[PDB]
């Protein structure tokens, strides 16, 4: 009345026998674990990886409250949660992680992973390649559930870094490795998203097929469902097709941009300027601003806007989406050697 020595044992049984009640059953099981154990530390990673924020936040608070290992796990998962909610800035997160004097290989791995998630989500890609290389999962010796879930996390992050570097075959290979390594829906979702994204400029049908695969596994999750709607919306704008995925009832930057893109695609510039006139009023991270300038460049047919667009793609270190204003400058007959030079040089 006892725990398995590896958390995957009970996970795999629940997924095999009771897949439609995984959350209900695991939420009950995890929240009754003794926080001092390796099972509870495993359950904390299970909950975060699944974005079961309710389960994870209770395990975090309990673990911090009252052993050595469990306290450390609670404290840096809490830093990840606070940073991902903007409760603390990156500087506070790094300062706190430093003050923890982290000892486990597991949390020294996760301390780097949580910064990687923050860089991805804030459109600040330049630090990621060097930071992810500091991770050495082979040092994780005791908890194999965590070594293997972290391995999946790293594959999906590597896939995103290769996408951001315009290394598209390698991007797809890493998400394919992630898919083969995992049974966690969250990682399958971002694997199919990233594979589909990598095909955006070359293969409409296969990009669509991957996003629709994402849709099929995301049915019952409104956030994941939204993501693939947004992915399909961007795909259809890139290819300047009729766009059945636009969200006209949204004031997010992501959805407003695609409204404008589609308006421009279909010769409704007054309506697009309205949208862009709404967008100038919102805080953009660098990568969002790069897209903003691209849209204004298309609306205005103004090369200066495409130059500003590549400036912020260079700043965010996005070597993929910069293909958009580069293609526009080409159509406007910009010097090929100029475009080669801009590709060569780097933001510092």
């Amino acid at each position: 009345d006892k725990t398995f020595n590896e958390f995957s044992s009970i996970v795999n049984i629940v997924k095999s026998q009771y897949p439609d009640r995984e959350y209900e059953l695991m939420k009950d099981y995890c929240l009754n674990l003794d926080v001092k154990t390796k099972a509870a530390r495993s359950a904390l990673e299970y909950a975060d990886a699944n974005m079961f924020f309710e389960i994870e936040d209770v395990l975090i608070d309990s673990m911090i409250s009252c052993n050595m290992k469990s306290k450390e796990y609670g404290k840096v998962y809490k830093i990840h949660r606070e940073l991902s909610n903007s409760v603390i800035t990156e500087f506070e997160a790094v300062k706190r992680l430093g003050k923890l004097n982290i000892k486990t290989p597991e949390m020294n791995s996760f301390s780097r992973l949580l910064l990687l998630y923050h860089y991805l989500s804030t459109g600040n890609f330049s630090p990621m390649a060097q930071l992810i290389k500091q991770i050495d999962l082979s040092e994780i010796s005791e908890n194999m559930y965590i070594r293997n879930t972290y391995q999946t996390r790293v594959h999906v992050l590597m896939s995103n870094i290769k996408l951001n570097e315009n290394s598209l075959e390698e991007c797809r290979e890493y998400s394919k490795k992630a898919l083969e390594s995992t049974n966690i829906l969250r990682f399958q979702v971002f694997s199919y998203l990233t594979i589909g994204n990598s095909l955006l400029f070359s293969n409409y049908e296969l990009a669509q097929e991957n996003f629709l695969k994402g849709l099929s596994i995301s049915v019952q999750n409104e956030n994941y469902n939204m993501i693939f709607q947004q992915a399909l919306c961007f795909l259809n704008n890139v290819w300047r097709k009729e766009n059945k995925w636009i969200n006209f009832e949204s004031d997010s930057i992501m959805d407003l941009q695609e409204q404008a893109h589609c308006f421009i695609n279909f010769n409704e510039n007054s309506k697009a300027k309205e949208v862009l006139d709404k967008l100038d009023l919102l805080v953009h991270n660098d990568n969002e601003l790069a897209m903003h300038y691209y849209l204004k460049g298309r609306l205005e047919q103004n090369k200066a806007c495409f130059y500003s667009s590549i400036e912020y793609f260079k700043k965010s270190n996005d070597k993929f989406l910069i293909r958009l204003p580069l293609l526009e400058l080409q159509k406007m007959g910009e010097n090929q050697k100029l475009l080669e030079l801009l590709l060569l040089l780097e933001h510092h």
């Binding site: 998630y117 995103n160 994204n197």
Partner: peptide, 6 residues
Amino acid sequence: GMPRGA
């Protein structure tokens, strides 16, 4: 824009 995640 383009959704991203991991």
